[PDB]
A paper describes a structure:
Gap junction channels (GJCs) mediate intercellular communication by connecting two neighbouring cells and enabling direct exchange of ions and small molecules. Like all connexin homologues, Cx43 monomers assemble into hexameric hemichannels (HCs), also known as connexons. HCs that reach the plasma membrane of one cell may interact with their counterparts on the neighbouring cell, forming GJCs, typically organized into hexagonal arrays at the intercellular interface. GJCs formed by Cx43 are crucial for a wide range of physiological processes, from propagation of heart action potentials to maintenance of neuro-glial syncytium and skin wound healing.
Here, we describe the structure of a human Cx43 GJC solved by cryo-EM and single particle analysis at 2.26 Å resolution. The overall architecture of the protein complex resembles that observed with other connexin GJCs, with two HCs (connexons) from adjacent plasma membrane regions coupled to form a full GJC. The reconstructed putative gate region of Cx43 shows several narrow openings connecting the pore vestibule and the pore interior: a single ~6–7 Å wide central opening and six adjacent openings of similar dimensions. This arrangement of the gate region is distinct from any of the previously observed states of connexin GJCs or HCs. The NTD of Cx43 is arranged near parallel to the membrane plane, in a centre-oriented conformation. In contrast, the TM2 of Cx43 is shifted away from the pore centre, creating six openings. The arrangement of the Cx43 NTD appears to be stabilized by a small molecule: a density element likely corresponding to a bound small molecule is present within this region (referred to as the ‘NTD lipid site’), wedged between the adjacent NTDs. Thus, although the conformation of the Cx43 gate features an opening, this site is blocked by a yet unidentified small molecule (which we refer to as ‘lipid-N’). In addition to the lipid-N molecules stabilizing the NTD arrangement, the cryo-EM density of Cx43 GJC features several well resolved densities inside the pore region (lipid-1 and -2).
Numbering used by the authors:
A (entry chain C), B (entry chain D), C (entry chain E), D (entry chain F), E (entry chain A), F (entry chain B): 2 to 105, 151 to 235
Amino acid sequence: GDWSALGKLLDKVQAYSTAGGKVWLSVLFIFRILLLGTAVESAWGDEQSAFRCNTQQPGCENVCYDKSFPISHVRFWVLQIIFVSVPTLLYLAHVFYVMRKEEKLLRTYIISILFKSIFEVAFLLIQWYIYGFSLSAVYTCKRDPCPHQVDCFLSRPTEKTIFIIFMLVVSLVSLALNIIELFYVFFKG
Amino acid sequence: GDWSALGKLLDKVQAYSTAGGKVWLSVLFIFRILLLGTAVESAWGDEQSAFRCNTQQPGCENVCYDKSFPISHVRFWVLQIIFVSVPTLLYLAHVFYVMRKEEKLLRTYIISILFKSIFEVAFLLIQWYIYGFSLSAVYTCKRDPCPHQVDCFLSRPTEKTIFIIFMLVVSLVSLALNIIELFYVFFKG
Amino acid sequence: GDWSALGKLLDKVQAYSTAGGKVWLSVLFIFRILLLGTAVESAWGDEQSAFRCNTQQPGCENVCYDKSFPISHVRFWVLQIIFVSVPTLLYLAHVFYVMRKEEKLLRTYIISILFKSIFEVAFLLIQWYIYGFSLSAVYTCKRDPCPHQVDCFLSRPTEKTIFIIFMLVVSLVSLALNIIELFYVFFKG
Amino acid sequence: GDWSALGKLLDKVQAYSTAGGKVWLSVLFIFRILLLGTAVESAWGDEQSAFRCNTQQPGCENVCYDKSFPISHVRFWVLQIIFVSVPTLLYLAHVFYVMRKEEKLLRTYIISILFKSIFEVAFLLIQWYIYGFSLSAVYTCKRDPCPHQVDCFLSRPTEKTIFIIFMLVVSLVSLALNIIELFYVFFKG
Amino acid sequence: GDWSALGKLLDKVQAYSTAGGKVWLSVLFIFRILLLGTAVESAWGDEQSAFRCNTQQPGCENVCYDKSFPISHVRFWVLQIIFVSVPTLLYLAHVFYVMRKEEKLLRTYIISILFKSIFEVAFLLIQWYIYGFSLSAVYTCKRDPCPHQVDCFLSRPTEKTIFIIFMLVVSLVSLALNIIELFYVFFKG
Amino acid sequence: GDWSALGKLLDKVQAYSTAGGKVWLSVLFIFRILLLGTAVESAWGDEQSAFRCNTQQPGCENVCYDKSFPISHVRFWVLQIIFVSVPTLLYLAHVFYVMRKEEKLLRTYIISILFKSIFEVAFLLIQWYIYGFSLSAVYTCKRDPCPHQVDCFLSRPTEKTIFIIFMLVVSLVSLALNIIELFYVFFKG
């Protein structure tokens, strides 16, 4: 029975955060995890199996899908959320070690928040560069195996576009909350 | 061993709710989650794989399925339940922070309930606009790849219609309970 | 460490039940859940994929399967068990609130038992009306896309019939136990 | 912290059992559950999908598989283990209620053991009648859709035969242990 | 809160084991379980589906796969690890009963270790007899349905061979540790 | 309630580690496990099913896939992480036994760290030898069943290349941290 230690650890890390920014950030994080784990994962299930091209050339479908999707959106979002979460976990464990020292910091919190913001904007920029924020039903593919130009058709482009916009909005809200947090720490300083 | 704290937290949030409205709302929520997680998820498993169109045009099936189902009903319902649940979690965590302040509100509960009602009615209206409340076995598809008009056939339209009506009834009951809750808070005020 | 509270809650709800009826009902419920979760779910896995019709008409298989199975037996049974379980959960939570009042009913138990009986008989009648209690290997399908009449063949009809009879027997036993419970409460009154 | 109550409940039920019969029976039960849950379930995964018949008749494969396998071996074994386990759970819960009476039997144990033996021998006899204890690679099918007689080929007959023999040996060992238990209770009486 | 009892039970069983043999055996067991549960299970996923034969004879692929693989390697390894684990569980539960007697053995440990060694060597010999320790890409199949001799091709033979060698090395290390354990008990005696 | 013992065990093992090296290593390990368990596993799902070759020769696809992928990257990475983790678990359990002795070492930590470094560099060298650090969309296959030379096409080569580079970077960071740890222990000595 050591429920008090976890409560004290939770209090210490939030002691340097805004009133209510912590709760909105945590709720938004669990919202994003729930959305990623159930809906978008099942939406992207048949990304290659339902992918089809109008050609008889063997191997054209493989290269055309590879060119159309350099990386799946779901795996990209998983990487983004992991990269966003890593600095927070680092800071939490560092504060845990600080408490262990106390039994026998603010600058690190600022660095973690700022790095999380950097990672979020970097992932957004990469998504804009590679894919944009929409998916087209018809993709024109010009790859070496395929003769001339071929037409290929994605799986559920519209629902994927909807989920892409949802994830973009979620990322933007998270970034805005992080900037507000940084501004509050600047105000305190 | 800190079972008392969770009980006190549960008591505090329900202190502003009707006698018995809380239990009906919670039971209905777990009912909806159980129905969504087991039955309707398996019902929508072959939505695109069993989807078929009477044509020889390559890529016509993809675009016709995309036009017929801009977003899957199951994923739409997952989004709806998440959006309905978010304000409740926000209020619960806010009350937790209020208790933390007490160790060392009603307006937020009203706002959360009202926003949950807004989200429920908005999702119902969106479902009515895009899909309606029934599914037809035969869908006439007129999309660019397909020549003229083609006939396509959905997977298990009748069982999906039954589950759609079930979810509509569940959403209506939840909205009615929320309005009764709001009326009770108005009566108290 | 609050094991005593759950024991007291368990005692209070069973205080109004017969000697031994509670244990048989609980064992039968867990039996039905185990049977539904493992065996019958896997038995119905290929209900549409292995479903086949003797025709060349595009879309005839879809409409014929839809007409043959308006709702899957497994999902129907899931709905039935959820509907049967809901009144019990309502009564348990109501008794929990009654204990909370005591810290600072029989009619509801009767109503819950009677409503559970009503739901059980209603689901049995619906199953009898739509399907009966057997499955035939060959189904004659007369639907609009299909020309004239077509012959279709179900997946594992015999094993499904066996499981249907098993579920019917389980439901009948549960209903009989519920009627015995109601008779005992009448005897007490 | 109520670890003592579960220990006392465990002691009370085993108080009427042989020295060491309890441990062998429990180990054998967990062995059977582990074998059923991992190996044989995956072995029977493609029972119908890999099932093939040498014919061009539509629907012949469905009826031939249905006739060859009235019920899957894995589901049959799941039913058998559930039926064997039910009397033990009934007796355990009855002893729990007896302890509740004590805070404020042997004949039932004998009945449960004997009924478990009956169920085991009944399931063995049913398996012998329907299937035997071996699987043949080639099955001759004479069903109405199929013209004359057709040849069908099972999926992995040899490995399935091996697992069938394993389950038969496990069931025989369990029955022998149950008979030894009954003989010991007779010796005590 | 009864953490002390499990620690005492752990101490009692290891009291008859070598210094460090216990930890190496436990680590090796968890290593084998982790390797079996994740890597080799996914490696053997398409053992029959990707299995192909150069023939037009219906049913030749089924019988050729059955003859090539009398039992899957993964299921064989699951059986082997279960058989190896059973004597250890028997001994642990026997020591638990011995402690229960104490509240109100070495020979069994020797027997369990020796039987575990016997089972390990028996499974290794069976694997050598049926399969050997390698898999060939091309299998020549001479079975009744197939005319003359046919050529069949396994799924991922090289990776399966690598995992087979890994499991062989793991089994050999476990057997060597068991023999060292037996020699130590002989030295003590 | 024995939370103190686990804390003491955690303190003892980290007592010989650098300030902050432990936390970075642990965070990196959980990062690698999360990346392997969700993203790369789903990325490699259709490695053989989507693998295609431009030939009519039966069995050419099987042998060409086998030659192209002697072992899957995901299973190789699972083996690598297991091999890296094993020495750490050995050291932790050894320290646990040392504490048990204390109730009634540095050289082992050095050996475990150095062996973990050896395993990491060995797996990196093996990956470089067999595969390199990139995947090509088109693979030229010259195997016995296939006539002359055939062209085969991998599934999602670009996304797999991205994940391969990610895993390479992760492994390099882990190795660098291990070398820094060894240098610190040398400095202490």
